Symmetry: none
């Protein structure tokens, strides 16, 4: 994803839009089904902080991290207007500065399109490291490899599996890293054992992982 | 720059890395602001061809040239996987084999650290020659002379302005030719008149030149 893509759509940047709320209310019940015990949570690639505020209201100590200065800037204003104590930090999910075993939870939502294989490998490694052995890694992603076929329902869809990426034209174009449930889980198997898994929609998944 | 430096960092060798994409998306809008009319483009010192594919998708006839056999080899594989018609050739920017007035555009991005004064002089001369009088020379460079002071934020930085070079240690060391906006433009004034100039970041510049 990129600058224009996010400026144009509210789904990941406008916490009060119907698009964003829809995402929250869909995941909310699933997140509570596996986050009964409160603790320290890390919102990796938090965007504008929507899921952070949600967890903070459920009695969680939240820390939000994102690589975009713009995402973080908006996050803070939202935290200000909502009088939130969630701390937002501009950081790289591929290399976090937190100490080892710092979190009880680490949530990673709708963000894999931003990582190629070797980068997602680094993120998983970092997640396992900053997670307490008793902690939980919870991620939600879309099998865009399976969705690719009938994705157009957007003017064009130019794939390239010889690279695992795809260009979608809406004008402007965006190139996404394409992931399939089998590819995500393979890399996950190097660092975690799966606690649970929920199928969302036609091709989305909420997975609960425990660090090794 | 050199072999290890490029093998270690993805910025100029991994077209799908976040580092490389960041560079593309930052320059993309600026390149279109001065490349409204499509035509024949020469990507001088193209590296792995990232900016070539970008222009090719915008409807440009692209030719990529680089002195490294390795850069060119990877470029071709990327072109294959992306099913691109961009032709990559292993050549020397200091002495191109193209006929005079062959291109409408010649882009030169993040590559001056590789040229000492007399070499960059030869490149500019060659660029003017292969460029159509109505063509445009577009280069992006970093004033590493101004950046030198606060570059460390890398273990060491050993300059040597009595030579216009600097050694940066990350292990391994790399020696870069150091250029300042004033030095680059001086040599440019011998062959071109400037059409436009955009300041990028704290000390980087995108310059548009017209041949004399
Ligand atoms: C779909 S968006 C927002 C996702 C957010 N978790 C949500 O559900 O609202 C994906 C975010 O990933 C972030 N991102 C991309 N690469 C990153 C990296 N290396 N480290 C941290 N965040 C990154 C972007 O800045 C972008 O805000
Ligand atoms: C930072 S790198 C890649 C730059 C590329 N334009 C990009 O932005 O992705 C600089 C490139 O300059 C090339 N180079 C160095 N000397 C050269 C010469 N005399 N002729 C052509 N390319 C040269 C290298 O092989 C190296 O790939």
């Amino acid at each position: 994803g990129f600058k224009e893509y996010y400026r144009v759509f509210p789904t990941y940047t406008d916490i009060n839009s119907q698009e964003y709320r829809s995402r929250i209310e869909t995941l909310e019940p699933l997140l509570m089904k596996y986050m009964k015990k409160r603790g320290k949570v890390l919102d990796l690639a938090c965007g504008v902080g929507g899921f952070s505020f949600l967890l903070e209201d459920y009695g969680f100590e939240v820390v939000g991290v994102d690589i975009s200065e713009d995402m973080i800037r908006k996050a803070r204003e939202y935290a200000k207007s909502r009088e939130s104590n969630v701390e937002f930090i501009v950081g790289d999910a591929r290399k976090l500065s937190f100490e080892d075993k710092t979190f009880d939870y680490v949530i990673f939502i709708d963000s894999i399109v931003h990582f190629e294989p070797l980068e997602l490998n680094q993120v998983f490694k970092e997640v396992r490291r900053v997670l307490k052995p008793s902690g939980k890694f919870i991620m939600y992603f879309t099998d865009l490899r399976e969705l690719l076929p009938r994705l157009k329902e957007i003017s064009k869809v130019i794939p390239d599996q010889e690279e695992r990426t795809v260009v979608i034209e809406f004008s402007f174009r965006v190139r996404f890293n394409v992931w399939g449930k089998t590819g995500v889980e393979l890399l996950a198997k190097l660092y975690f054992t799966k606690e649970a898994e929920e199928k969302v929609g036609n091709y989305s998944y909420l997975t609960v992982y425990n660090p090794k």
